[PDB]
Amino acid sequence: GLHMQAIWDKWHAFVPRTYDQWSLWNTVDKLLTQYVNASMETTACEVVGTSLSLLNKVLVENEVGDIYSYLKILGKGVNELKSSILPENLVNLFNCLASLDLLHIFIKYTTSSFFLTDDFVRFIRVCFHSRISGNLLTLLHFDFCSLTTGNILGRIALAFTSANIFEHARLALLQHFMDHSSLLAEDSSTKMNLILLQRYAVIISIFLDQGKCEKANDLITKLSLPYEELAENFVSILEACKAFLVANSEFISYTYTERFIHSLRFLQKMLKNQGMAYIYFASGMLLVYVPDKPFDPATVESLRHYLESLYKESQILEIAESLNSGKVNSVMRRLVSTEISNSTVYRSLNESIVPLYSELEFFMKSVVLNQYIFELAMRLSKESNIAVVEEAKSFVTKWKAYIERIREAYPQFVDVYELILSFISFMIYGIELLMFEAKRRLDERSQILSTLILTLVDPSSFARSFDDVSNLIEQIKVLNDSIRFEIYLFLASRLCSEKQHSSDTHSLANSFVLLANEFYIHNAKIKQKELEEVVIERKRFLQLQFAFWSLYNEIYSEKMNVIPLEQLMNTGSYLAKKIKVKNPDMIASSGFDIVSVVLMMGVKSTNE
């Protein structure tokens, strides 16, 4: 049981009411499905979809007929596009751009927005660029990598190893990211912290309406100027708890949501605080939307058969007043005549929602079971070996299966399904922060490898270390190795470049000594294999050791340090390209450092 009808009246958003309006929506959906599949020709098809957008906007203004004409014209052009590339992978980069698009779409838009904004048009261009399963959820109105730029590494892996069309699409996604430059540059998931804050603020506005303190709290909550929002977010959470006192009981997950939020608003390891506050507020608002039966903002047919009885008795009154006198009027007739003197809903002529209610009842009865929820809170406390990451994956997978079965059927209950989708999105955001922390604390050697790859590739990593050289040597011990020996040579090249600027006797000499002991152990392993393709690998290792002793002697010479930092940068770029060719695993990701400086190195990865 819940109230949930004024809540369903709180948004009660615009949607198709006429059967013809919903038919036009479905036709436009099939049209864009054929149409958003596949240069400057892509910008032309973007203008074509923009024409489709303005046309469906006119259709939303209750305009018919000429819609069917321009639709037949669009169908001719769509069969033409069906008549008039380069198979690959890592389209998850395009999905990440779509995630950033939905992020910016929620981000700058607090009031009403049909998403016609210009950057948003570029997002639509990338969305047509990137075919997706979902039926325009955003139009009607994919999150996890908020700190994980390691798929950028997969982009570097895509940059590691038709091919001209691949470099063309590389430059395409590159110019798109140059357009998506400021579209994520501000605050990785600290923006999403404010977004969950805005979702909680939406629940807070949904609490009370005309209470002047609550109206002022929702107004200031609507007054989320992002600098001032980050300034008084704590005052907002405090006043939120204060108004939560003013309401009724059972706000326990809602109260602890604010506690874990103030942590996630401030705390490192706050992915746990993020998932905790997200799951707690999601449980609060989900129980807020938890009626035991259907009562939304969603007939009077007694007037139908009533006026039918009035009219048919008026007819019978005339047919009897015939046999009374023979003129067509009566006091009975004038009486029943004076008695006969006495929006945009969906066309609901049959709404047998018992099966759809049972379908929602299974997915929310697992929630009424809540052993998923309770066991997830228990695992999200601590103590996961590895199995809870796979458990959160399987739970979100069964959730995605139920969500797909939901997005498949049920022509009715559309707004209810949309609200359930937003709620399951918040739950999956909590589950995402949780499974992310689970993979983080599960193991980190490949994450240490990813940090080393970030140490292998950044100008911040190229800023200016011998103990850190020993740390990297311990990583190489923990780390093929001849390619890692080439990486050690690249490190020695950086050492010689820093040697050029200024000279420290202890660091330079002990560093060369460390590299010498490394090469000595390498020659030891080489002679051990000699006591024992791979021979060509040993030959390449011999050529490598030849260049090593040559540059060592030249470094022990140090006659003239002609080391171009441009060539050093291209060398670090090629080392990163070899590392992108090296990495075979699918688990780790970037620890929220950069993807744009990586795109600045991705610029070199596409060029030269």
PDB file of C-alpha atoms in Angstrom, residues 39-40 109 150 189 226 288 311 393 400 402 434 460 471 498-499 501 553:
ATOM      1  CA  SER A  39      30.877  11.555 -42.566  1.00  0.00           C
ATOM      2  CA  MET A  40      29.326  14.862 -43.501  1.00  0.00           C
ATOM      3  CA  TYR A 109      18.697  20.561 -17.624  1.00  0.00           C
ATOM      4  CA  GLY A 150      40.267   2.018 -18.744  1.00  0.00           C
ATOM      5  CA  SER A 189      30.709  11.648 -10.699  1.00  0.00           C
ATOM      6  CA  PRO A 226      26.254  24.425  -9.490  1.00  0.00           C
ATOM      7  CA  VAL A 288       7.294   5.217  -1.462  1.00  0.00           C
ATOM      8  CA  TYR A 311     -33.462   9.352 -24.256  1.00  0.00           C
ATOM      9  CA  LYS A 393      26.674  -8.850 -11.694  1.00  0.00           C
ATOM     10  CA  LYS A 400      18.225  -6.396 -16.799  1.00  0.00           C
ATOM     11  CA  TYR A 402      13.241  -8.478 -16.101  1.00  0.00           C
ATOM     12  CA  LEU A 434      29.044  -1.582  -5.008  1.00  0.00           C
ATOM     13  CA  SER A 460      52.218  14.047 -15.239  1.00  0.00           C
ATOM     14  CA  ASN A 471      59.221   0.257  -6.823  1.00  0.00           C
ATOM     15  CA  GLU A 498      66.568  14.200 -16.838  1.00  0.00           C
ATOM     16  CA  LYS A 499      70.329  13.644 -16.687  1.00  0.00           C
ATOM     17  CA  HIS A 501      68.833  19.004 -17.358  1.00  0.00           C
ATOM     18  CA  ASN A 553      78.320   3.382 -22.921  1.00  0.00           C
TER      19      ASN A 553
END
